[PDB]
């Protein structure tokens, strides 16, 4: 249901986009006012489509698992493109079924594999609304040599933005330029599963983490999160990966 047009995109229209994406995700409940996602849903209920439209009015449809906001694959015209991983093979039973051509991407949805495939670490891939527009275009035509980079842009501008207010704001503020994401942004992406897990545990442990989560802040300092008074809990994280989303 959720759509975003890059043409005329503002910091505001991008925020409306990311609040709608968040809103389209079922939750178990909230913890500390942070929505806690469902661990599991039936296949028929597990996937949603996000539509993104570049300056040229070319549209890609992106399939995400609503239990974890992982991107499973995308569709551009008659062609579907799914990550080479079991989660996406499963999604491909439910989504993009009338795609005439079905491609399996030569990588899993995992930043290490995507970075290897792009020959590029995230810290050197620009982000911003114009970056998102080139990603869409790159993916609409499936440059197999530029696609992995453009999947990292796409991932961070949807999935990651959805998960962290800091990521959202930082991307959406680049309306007519691009930026290189800080180690802070990267840290938050890397640490989502563990932070989420720790906040869950804290909920039956008086707000204490059982295990420190080490983040990098915007001054590049290593900082240790051990409780629910951390700024990352009260003023950043916007979605909790359920601890039971995997065995």
């Amino acid at each position: 249901m959720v759509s975003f047009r890059l043409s005329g995109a503002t910091s505001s229209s991008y925020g409306v986009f990311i609040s709608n994406l968040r809103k389209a995700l079922p939750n178990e409940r909230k913890l500390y006012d942070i929505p806690l996602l469902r661990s599991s849903l039936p296949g028929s209920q597990r996937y949603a489509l996000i539509h993104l439209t570049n300056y040229a009015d070319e549209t890609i449809s992106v399939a995400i698992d609503v239990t974890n906001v992982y991107i499973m694959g995308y569709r551009a015209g008659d062609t579907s493109y799914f990550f080479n991983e079991a989660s996406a093979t499963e999604a491909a039973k439910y989504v993009f079924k009338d795609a005439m051509r079905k491609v399996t991407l030569p990588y899993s949805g995992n930043y290490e594999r995507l970075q290897t495939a792009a020959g590029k670490i995230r810290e050197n891939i620009p982000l911003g609304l114009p970056a998102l527009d080139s990603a869409i275009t790159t993916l609409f035509y499936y440059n197999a040599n530029s696609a992995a980079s453009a999947l990292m842009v796409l991932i961070q501008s949807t999935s990651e933005a959805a998960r962290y207010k800091f990521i959202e704001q930082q991307i959406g503020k680049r309306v007519d330029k691009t930026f290189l994401p800080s180690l802070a942004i990267i840290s938050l992406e890397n640490s989502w599963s563990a932070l989420s897990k720790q906040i869950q545990i804290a909920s039956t442990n008086n707000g204490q983490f059982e295990s420190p989560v080490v983040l990098i802040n915007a001054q590049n300092q290593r900082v240790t999160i051990t409780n629910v008074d951390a700024g990352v809990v009260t003023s950043n994280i916007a979605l909790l990966l359920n601890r039971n989303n995997m065995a």
């Binding site: 207010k165 800091f166 704001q169 930082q170 800080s182 802070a184 983040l215 802040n217 915007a218 001054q219 900082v223 240790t224 999160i225 951390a230 700024g231 990352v232 003023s235 950043n236």
Partner: peptide
């Protein structure tokens, strides 16, 4: 709001 992310981490 900045790029300094003050209070959004620890």
């Amino acid at each position: 709001d900045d790029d300094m992310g003050f209070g959004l981490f620890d």
